[PDB]
Amino acid sequence: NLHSLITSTTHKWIFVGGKGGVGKTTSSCSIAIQMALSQPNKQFLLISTDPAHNLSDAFGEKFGKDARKVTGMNNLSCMEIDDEALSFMEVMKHIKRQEQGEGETFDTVIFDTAPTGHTLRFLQLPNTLSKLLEKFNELKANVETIRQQFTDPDLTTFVCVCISEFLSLYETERLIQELISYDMDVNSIIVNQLLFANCKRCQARWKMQKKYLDQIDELYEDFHVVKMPLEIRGLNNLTKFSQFLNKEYNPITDGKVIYELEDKEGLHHHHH
């Protein structure tokens, strides 16, 4: 589970990459909602390159190229955006230089990467860029540093999200393998949509699920495996689902609590 980040005082950067709409936006939320909720004050500020903008949709408010902490959050702003490098670097330092001015420093960005998978290039711009310079000046020293500074794990940790389904799993295999080419921190991944222990005609789907869970256990020992039950829209609805993000969910709790949380969104059973 992700209490290492829910707590980590030391991180300036947290990328939640999860191209797939697997409530990835919701992961990003819950981590920021849970972090800021746990580190009572010390405003973290949440962006999502997500071209969809599910994030604004997520908290129940419309954000954009501007910060704006949410109603009830004494310590958490949000933000969203769309060559490709242009998009990144310029608008990347848009947020950087943007908050240098808006008042003072502000602690760290939950970076909900674009599901577009275009965020891959958004993540190697500086590497090959510092090359051009070293064999062709302010930002030049900056890139060599920040490039090593993104490499540095006690500052820049990535974090993937999954459904049980095998296909994601493979894209996550190939994904991480690319991430290490970058040489970035990664050791942590959350999974979604899990059912647990009538709706046994549903549990018959968790069966196949449960197994896929075990292929990721054995396959990744160096990593947290966050089993997350089951997209919400409210702040509270969202905040409660973060509570399971940090504190290891549990099928006695999970049970009574999520039975309540679905009966929220108007969901004598039935599938179809």
Using rule CB under 5 A, residue 197 touches Zn ion? no
Q: Classify strands 76-80 and 225-227 as parallel, antiparallel or unpaired.
A: unpaired
204 lines the binding site for Zn ion (CB under 5 A): no
Shortest separation between residue 198's beta carbon and Zn ion, angstroms: 7
Rule CB under 5 A: choose which of 139, 180, 202, 204 binds Zn ion. 202
Residues near 62 by beta carbon (within 8 Å), at least 6 away in sequence:
56
By C-beta, is 93 or 201 nearer to Zn ion?
201
- For residue 86, the tally of other CB atoms under 10 A from its CB is 10
- CA dihedral (217, 221, 223, 226) in degrees, to 10, reads 30
**Among the residue ranges 53-61, 92-100, 201-209, 233-241, the one whose residues contact Zn ion (CB under 5 A):** 201-209
**What gap in Å lies between CA 33 and CA 46, rounded to an integer?**
9
Q: Taking Cα atoms as reference points, which of 162, 176, 172, 186 lies closest to residue 21?
A: 162
For the question of residue 183 being annotated catalytic, the response is no
State which residue has the least CB distance to Zn ion. Answer: 202
Whole-angstrom CA distances from 162 to 86, 90, 135, 212, 223 are: 29, 30, 41, 11, 13
Least distance to Zn ion, CB of residue 85, Å: 47
CA–CA gap between residue 206 and residue 193 (Å, rounded): 10
Residue 201 engages Zn ion in binding (rule: CB under 5 A): yes
Q: Which is nearer to Zn ion, 180 or 199 (CB)?
A: 199
CB of 203 to Zn ion, least distance (A): 8
Instruction: Return the residue of 86, 132, 199, 219 that touches Zn ion, per CB under 5 A.
Output: 199
CB of 271 to Zn ion, least distance (A): 5
Binding region for Zn ion (CB under 5 A): 199, 201-202
Catalytic residues: 50
